[PDB]
Design a protein around this ligand. Structure first.
Ligand code: HEM
Ligand code: M4F
Ligand code: CL
Length: 393
């Protein structure tokens, strides 16, 4: 009843061009079995959305990577939010929601926008730049560590640590094994920065620790919640902004529409998140036997959700393979859906908006002018290098 496929969604060939295999996964059936890793897969929008929105049946506390925490030791102590189910999930989630709230966004928006404008002005002086290292990486590095309250020393550990976290959700392939082999110095740095004395006043980290007297979290929960922001808060935005710039570079007609109305910046970023889906995949684990799209899945089974495939499913989207900055993007699953839906989405959207606004106002053309190099990661989709020429407006 359930089709069995040999596709390895964590192979370099798949990462290099996932779209044919993602159509094969969608068209084989609503539920497939991936023989390579002994997991179920759902690649259509309908089933991905259904799984995300039944956290009781499709839980997160047994891990959202391939590894089942009931069978293996987690590579690091479980996240108190990402790798927790209700009710344990609920109060840590509420704390992060209030730490990354609209009021916080109002306090940081002016500085984030000034840094975006400054970066684009700087890049225009150089003309030919690498849109990854010099923009998608450089801009988040210029605002987010400071917004966390991190000291300057050791920030070079942040992107390596994030690459490790996202590789570690994958199966035990070479990408994951190599990441873990090199992890010790990055874990040491990150864990140390999570302690209250090491987080500067008024930043996200200090605000988490300040919430430890309301009865929502205790002081011993705050370091791991800081760890969540140091795991998820930087490399995601790097690949979100990189996706948006890559989209504008490939689709000059959409850059031209964005220039003509810079208030489309926020939706142009949201559409880039749908179109590229920088966070490609997450797993759930079934807590009971369950019927999903005509399939009977037993208890204790891993289910792989293809978020990027769901965001390209023609059953849900018109012209899914087109980048359209005025698309009605509401409902895409690039930030997830339901109780775990990205708690940092207001930070991600703020960064993406102000960067695309700066480009819209200052840049007339974005032309790829060198070899494009892809970066391979078990969970993240994005580029290693994107050489572009920026023409000033
Ligand atoms: C374009 C940028 C981003 C994308 C595409 C993205 C994607 C996602 C997705 C798909 C989830 C759902 C995980 C699941 O269902 O298991 C999630 C959750 C989460 N994200 Fe984001 N994220 C981004 C930026 C950020 C930022 C900037 C932060 C923090 C500053 C952040 C922190 C988190 C946390 C802590 C969770 C776990 C929430 C929970 O389990 O309740 N993310 N993200
Ligand atoms: O809590 C954490 O450590 C954590 C780590 C990664 C993560 O990934 C993404 F969902 F994509 F943002 C979310 C949360
Ligand atoms: Cl760690």
């Amino acid at each position: 009843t359930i089709p069995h496929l040999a596709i390895d969604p964590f192979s370099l060939d798949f990462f290099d061009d996932p779209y044919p295999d993602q159509q094969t996964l969608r068209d084989a059936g609503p539920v497939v079995y991936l023989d390579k890793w002994n997991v179920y897969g759902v690649a259509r929008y309908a089933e991905v959305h259904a799984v995300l929105n039944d956290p009781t049946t499709f839980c997160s506390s047994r891990g959202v990577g391939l590894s089942d925490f009931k069978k293996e030791k987690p590579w690091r102590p479980p996240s108190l939010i990402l790798e927790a189910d209700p009710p344990a999930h609920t109060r840590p989630r509420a704390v992060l929601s209030k730490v990354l709230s609209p009021a916080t966004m109002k306090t940081i928006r002016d500085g984030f926008a000034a840094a975006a404008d400054a970066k684009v002005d700087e890049l225009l002086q150089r003309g030919c730049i690498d849109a990854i290292a010099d923009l998608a990486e450089a801009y988040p590095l210029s605002v987010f560590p400071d917004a966390m309250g991190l000291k300057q020393e050791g920030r070079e550990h942040l992107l390596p640590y994030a690459g490790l976290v996202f590789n570690a959700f994958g199966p035990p392939n070479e990408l994951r094994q190599t990441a873990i082999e090199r992890s010790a110095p990055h874990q040491a740095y990150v864990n140390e920065q999570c302690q209250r004395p090491n987080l500067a006043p008024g930043g996200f980290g200090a605000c988490i620790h300040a919430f430890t007297d309301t009865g929502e979290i205790t002081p011993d929960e705050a370091p791991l919640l800081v760890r969540s922001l140091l795991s998820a808060g930087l490399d995601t935005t790097v690949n979100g902004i990189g996706a948006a710039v890559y989209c504008l570079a490939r689709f000059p007609g959409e850059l031209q529409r964005l220039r003509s109305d810079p208030t489309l910046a926020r939706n142009a970023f949201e559409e880039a998140v749908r179109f590229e889906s920088p966070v490609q995949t997450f797993f759930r684990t079934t807590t009971r036997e369950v019927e999903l799209g005509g399939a009977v899945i037993g208890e204790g089974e891993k289910v792989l959700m293809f978020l990027g495939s769901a965001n390209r499913d023609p059953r849900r989207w018109s012209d899914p393979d087109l980048y359209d900055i005025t698309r009605k993007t509401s409902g895409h699953v690039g930030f997830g859906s339901g109780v775990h839906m990205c708690v940092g989405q207001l930070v991600a959207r703020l960064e993406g908006e102000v960067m695309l606004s700066a480009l819209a106002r200052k840049v007339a053309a974005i032309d790829i002018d060198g070899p494009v190099k892809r970066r391979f990661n078990n969970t993240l989709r994005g580029l290693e290098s994107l050489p572009v020429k920026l023409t000033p407006a």
